Design a protein around this ligand. Structure first.
Ligand SMILES: *[C@@H]1O[C@H](CO)[C@@H](O[C@@H]2O[C@H](CO)[C@@H](O[C@@H]3O[C@H](CO[C@H]4O[C@H](CO)[C@@H](O)[C@H](O)[C@@H]4O)[C@@H](O)[C@H](O[C@H]4O[C@H](CO)[C@@H](O)[C@H](O)[C@@H]4O)[C@@H]3O)[C@H](O)[C@H]2NC(C)=O)[C@H](O)[C@H]1NC(C)=O
Ligand SMILES: *[C@@H]1O[C@H](CO)[C@@H](O[C@@H]2O[C@H](CO)[C@@H](O[C@@H]3O[C@H](CO)[C@@H](O)[C@H](O)[C@@H]3O)[C@H](O)[C@H]2NC(C)=O)[C@H](O)[C@H]1NC(C)=O
Ligand SMILES: *[C@@H]1O[C@H](CO)[C@@H](O)[C@H](O)[C@H]1NC(C)=O
Ligand SMILES: *[C@@H]1O[C@H](CO)[C@@H](O)[C@H](O)[C@H]1NC(C)=O
Ligand SMILES: *[C@@H]1O[C@H](CO)[C@@H](O)[C@H](O)[C@H]1NC(C)=O
Ligand SMILES: *[C@@H]1O[C@H](CO)[C@@H](O)[C@H](O)[C@H]1NC(C)=O
Ligand SMILES: *[C@@H]1O[C@H](CO)[C@@H](O)[C@H](O)[C@H]1NC(C)=O
Lengths: 255, 116, 196
């Protein structure tokens, strides 16, 4: 149940090059201090990724999905809550909703009728329109977990918390790798250079066709929020060489 | 589960109307197949009235059994206009209503009516 | 991890056969030892695999159907079996792969006035397909003479009610029955018990 939000003033998006991002653990097998080569789905260096900055002005159009997407976002208040996935999303194709609220995480595999502009948000946060869908007829899978180290509420200022996601579906099972990058005090423009090696979260034994997707942000209108910045890029299969350490974590990777 | 209770049972002279209804208490997901029944002291199980959007009743009493469906309070009403001394029987309401379980089939305790 | 078989096997009441209570169980761990060692179980015969090695076998889907019938017609559970309850209430196809368990609940399903809370469909013009539930209860007609409104000749209700009382002995036992199906599916196997 949502009125047509409108209040949309779209502008051309930005593109920033990928310096060092797009690295994840290939598998849950323990090694130590060795050079090993891999050939898998990866992120090219210095390629453009779409930058969206939101400060009124709102930026969340439809986002096509194809063979995994690398996402990043830099913030204090964790304005983003959840994501949606599917193919048509109109009470005919299986839909996946994910969101980690204040207390826990909810993963929903069911059939739905969302709003034209689904939302969960006026600087003070309200949980209004949390139930963006209107129908929950054919629900199959459910799961609950602890919230992904979200900061609750938040005051506008610097952006310390950098969160990056590599959502992918292969062999039905969906895999999520991520890491929390805090205390980035430096003024954010373009992207920082960092050697992250995103670590596993869940390996849901589900699977559907996903062609596009969207995320969720946080008086149906008149909402007021501070600045925020996030980043989206596609993935392609390539190869790399990785060096472990004596502990067994990657120190460097090269193309 | 959801308990069914009967209200309106009482001593009724032959010739006037009786209003008997079955209220449901508990976790009710909505009203469903409900059938009203009677048994005299000596006769076996028979179907008296109920549904079959199609409503069915007994013979020669079609215009006397009048129900009123109410979903806001998840309970209906039944009215037995112009009762007869041959209708001295205990009415049981059986409802297959949806609960935490897929459905529940329960028989109302019923109220005895003595018409003579 | 434990699959929620307890509430199914320890349910307070079992629904009617025409309203056969069936549940899909998935995404858990189902150990068969406790159910196998459950002493008051009387008959437990399975049709697809050996009934003592289900734990190492992992299946994606679990279907459980629970109900109460007579002790006389328990052998009507077999797939393709004849009988009014099989024809008008619930039928088992001959290709069904699964298990079936039956036991006694006569001490709780006996009414001094006669247990008439159980009902079963008895008339149906088109035999129900395997694994189907039919709820329509219109005034059935058989002969070419039109039937509508009142009951009578060629107009009989398609349902019948059981008669169970404690004075009844052999042949009128109210028996609780559960039927388990694990028909293989393209979905990956999820439900199965621990392996020692
Ligand atoms: C952030 O998100 C989490 C979930 O990811 C929310 O936490 C859950 O909140 C719901 C209610 O909002 C809680 O539901 C309540 O507890 C029971 C849940 O059902 C379970 O019951 C047993 C386990 O006890 C199992 O069969 C199975 O696991 C079920 O999932 C129920 O008692 C209630 O839910 C249902 O009750 C009846 C049952 O028929 C229905 O009629 C109701 O309509 C309802 O659907 C009850 O509502 C749930 O327990 C919470 N889980 C956890 C882990 O906390 C947070 O609330 C949310 N934070 C927010 C919104 O701020
Ligand atoms: C493998 O992991 C260990 C543990 O994370 C790394 O040890 C880290 O570095 C040195 C030893 O290599 C140590 O640092 C010490 O930190 C304390 C404060 O905690 C400080 O007081 C000491 O003076 C010293 O600097 C310590 O073991 C550890 N430091 C941490 C965890 O902060 C080790 O380097 C890793 N091996 C690699 C990366 O090859
Ligand atoms: C929103 O607009 C769309 C298209 O203009 C329309 O189909 C829909 O019904 C509208 N919904 C509301 C709540 O106004
Ligand atoms: C995107 O990449 C192309 C490389 O062909 C580059 O020319 C272009 O400048 C990039 N986009 C932006 C906004 O810089
Ligand atoms: C749910 O599934 C049934 C049977 O497959 C279908 O008839 C119904 O339309 C579905 N509901 C949806 C997709 O919302
Ligand atoms: C995905 O689309 C292909 C197109 O041929 C289809 O064969 C397949 O069944 C679809 N899978 C799902 C889960 O929708
Ligand atoms: C049902 O309850 C009894 C009584 O505690 C218990 O022994 C039995 O294990 C329960 N059933 C199942 C399937 O656990």
């Amino acid at each position: 149940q949502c009125v047509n939000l409108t209040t949309r003033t779209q502008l051309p998006p930005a593109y920033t090059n990928s310096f060092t991002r797009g690295v994840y653990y290939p598998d849950k097998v323990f090694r130590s201090s060795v050079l090993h080569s891999t050939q898998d789905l990866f992120l090219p260096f210095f390629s453009n990724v779409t930058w969206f900055h939101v400060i009124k002005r709102f930026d969340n159009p439809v986002l096509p999905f194809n063979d995994g997407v690398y996402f990043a976002s830099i913030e204090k208040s964790n304005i983003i809550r959840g994501w949606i996935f599917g193919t048509t999303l109109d009470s005919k194709t299986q839909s996946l909703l994910i969101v980690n609220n204040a207390t826990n995480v909810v993963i929903k595999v069911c059939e739905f009728q969302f709003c034209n502009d689904p939302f969960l948000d006026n600087k003070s946060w309200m949980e209004s329109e949390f139930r963006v869908y209107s129908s929950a007829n054919n629900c199959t899978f459910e799961y609950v977990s602890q919230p992904f180290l979200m900061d609750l509420e938040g005051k506008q200022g610097n952006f310390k918390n950098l969160r990056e996601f590599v959502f992918k579906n292969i062999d039905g099972y969906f895999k999520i790798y991520s890491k929390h990058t805090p205390i980035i005090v430096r003024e954010p423009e373009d992207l920082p250079q960092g050697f992250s090696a995103l670590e596993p979260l869940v390996d849901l034994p589900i699977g559907i066709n996903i062609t596009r997707f969207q995320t969720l942000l946080a008086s149906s209108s008149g909402w007021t929020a501070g600045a925020a910045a996030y980043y989206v890029g596609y993935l392609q299969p390539r190869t790399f060489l990785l060096k472990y350490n004596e502990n067994g974590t990657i120190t460097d990777a090269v193309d | 589960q959801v308990q069914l209770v009967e209200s309106g049972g009482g001593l009724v002279q032959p010739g006037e109307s009786l209003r008997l209804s079955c209220a449901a208490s508990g976790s009710i997901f909505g009203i469903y197949a409900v059938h009203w029944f009677r048994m005299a002291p000596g006769k076996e199980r028979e179907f008296t009235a109920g549904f079959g959007g199609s409503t069915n009743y007994a013979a020669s009493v079609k215009g006397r059994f009048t129900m009123s469906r109410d979903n806001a309070k998840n309970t209906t009403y039944l009215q037995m206009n112009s009762l007869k001394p041959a209708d001295t029987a205990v009415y049981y309401c059986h409802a297959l209503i949806k609960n935490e379980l897929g459905f529940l089939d329960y028989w109302g305790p019923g109220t005895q009516v003595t018409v003579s």
